[PDB]
Amino acid sequence: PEMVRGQVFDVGPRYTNLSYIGEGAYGMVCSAYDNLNKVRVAIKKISPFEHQTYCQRTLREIKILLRFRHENIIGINDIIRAPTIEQMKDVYIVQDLMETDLYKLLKTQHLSNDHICYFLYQILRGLKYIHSANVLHRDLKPSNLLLNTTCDLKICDFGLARVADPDHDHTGFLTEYVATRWYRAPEIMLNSKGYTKSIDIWSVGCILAEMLSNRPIFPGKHYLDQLNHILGILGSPSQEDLNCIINLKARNYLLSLPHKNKVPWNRLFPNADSKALDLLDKMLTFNPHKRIEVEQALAHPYLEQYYDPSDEPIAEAPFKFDMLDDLPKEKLKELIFEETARFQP
Numbered sequence: 001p002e003m004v005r006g007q008v009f010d011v012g013p014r015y016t017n018l019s020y021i022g023e024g025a026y027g028m029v030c031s032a033y034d035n036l037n038k039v040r041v042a043i044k045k046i047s048p049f050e051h052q053t054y055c056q057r058t059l060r061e062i063k064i065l066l067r068f069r070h071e072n073i074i075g076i077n078d079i080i081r082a083p084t085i086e087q088m089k090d091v092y093i094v095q096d097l098m099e100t101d102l103y104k105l106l107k108t109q110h111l112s113n114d115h116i117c118y119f120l121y122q123i124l125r126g127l128k129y130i131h132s133a134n135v136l137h138r139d140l141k142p143s144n145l146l147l148n149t150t151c152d153l154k155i156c157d158f159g160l161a162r163v164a165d166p167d168h169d170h171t172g173f174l175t176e177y178v179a180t181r182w183y184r185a186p187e188i189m190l191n192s193k194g195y196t197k198s199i200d201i202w203s204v205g206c207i208l209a210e211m212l213s214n215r216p217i218f219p220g221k222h223y224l225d226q227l228n229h230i231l232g233i234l235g236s237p238s239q240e241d242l243n244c245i246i247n248l249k250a251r252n253y254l255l256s257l258p259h260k261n262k263v264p265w266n267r268l269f270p271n272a273d274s275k276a277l278d279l280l281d282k283m284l285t286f287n288p289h290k291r292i293e294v295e296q297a298l299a300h301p302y303l304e305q306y307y308d309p310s311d312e313p314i315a316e317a318p319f320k321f322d323m324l325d326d327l328p329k330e331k332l333k334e335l336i337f338e339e340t341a342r343f344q345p
């Protein structure tokens with residue numbers, strides 16, 4: 001078995017000429033030559049079976065990606081694992097080889113307005129399909145947006161996804177932990193479990209602002225700091241928006257703050273396209289009920305060069321209910337085994 005940087009990489013014989021790329025908490029990514037298709041691919045080794053939550057995230061990612069087929073969502077081309085549960089200690093997910101991601105790109109590269117428009121269109125095209133499946137990504141950020149050498153964008157990492165459930169979204173103050181901090185909508189800190197599609201639109205808004213300046217728009221230094229940065233730019237929420245927050249702890253916290261004025265987007269982004277800033281404002285709306293939805297965003301004038309609803313497909317059949325939670329890791333392993341059987345031998 002071929003080894004890479006310490007780990008076993010038991011992908012033979014189809015995948016050769018392995019090359020290290022990255023690493024995670026319980027995973028490792030390598031590029032590899034696929035002799036059958038004669039192209040270099042990405043292979044992600046996952047070792048989740050010692051932990052309840054790793055098994056959950058692995059199962060979610062595999063279940064969703066095997067049911068999705070969309071140009072702006074990374075596919076699963078192959079899955080490699082032992083022939084029996086007893087022998088399965090890792091799972092290898094084979095995917096299209098992508099040159100970079102948006103996080104690495106924004107660290108060094110300035111984006112032209114045409115590139116910003118093109119990336120944003122592809123993000124929203126993929127999001128439309130995801131939301132049309134009644135699924136919430138729930139961790140959209142630059143590092144989860146892959147790009148190849150011709151700037152084709154693909155959304156990845158559905159390990160934190162959920163089936164939408166707006167009827168059960170309301171919760172209490174400062175208790176929820178959804179998405180990555182800089183891309184986390186204000187209502188998560190206030191009164192939302194993150195079970196509504198507007199959670200994802202906020203993240204996309206944060207990404208767009210980051211594409212405009214190469215800096216995160218809301219760089220909170222810890223969980224509790226994030227709302228400071230959001231309100232420092234959006235200003236104090238209106239009385240109408242506060243009336244939509246029935247939770248008293250959340251509403252009274254906002255009421256205890258001094259008045260802050262909105263900072264105009266054109267002062268923060270003096271070089272930006274005015275149409276881009278109009279859309280940015282509609283995605284970074286404080287009130288999630290007033291926040292623009294994915295199909296409205298696709299139709300915004302900023303994207304009129306690409307907008308084509310007949311070329312923005314939706315899912316063949318949505319997820320009807322959330323899968324799971326209290327299942328032991330032994331059962332999750334069996335379900336991961338069962339979900340990956342179609343790629344055997």
Ligand SMILES: N=[N+]=NC[C@H]1O[C@@H](n2c(SCCCC(=O)NN)nc3c(N)ncnc32)[C@H](O)[C@@H]1O
Nearest residue numbers: 022023024029042095096097098101143144156
């Ligand atoms: N985790 N990890 N490994 C870190 C490295 O994996 C790279 N990568 C990943 S992982 C995707 C999860 C999002 C993330 O975390 N970064 N984008 N899929 C890749 C792929 N299909 N092709 C090429 N490179 C990939 C990724 O670009 C990063 O450079």
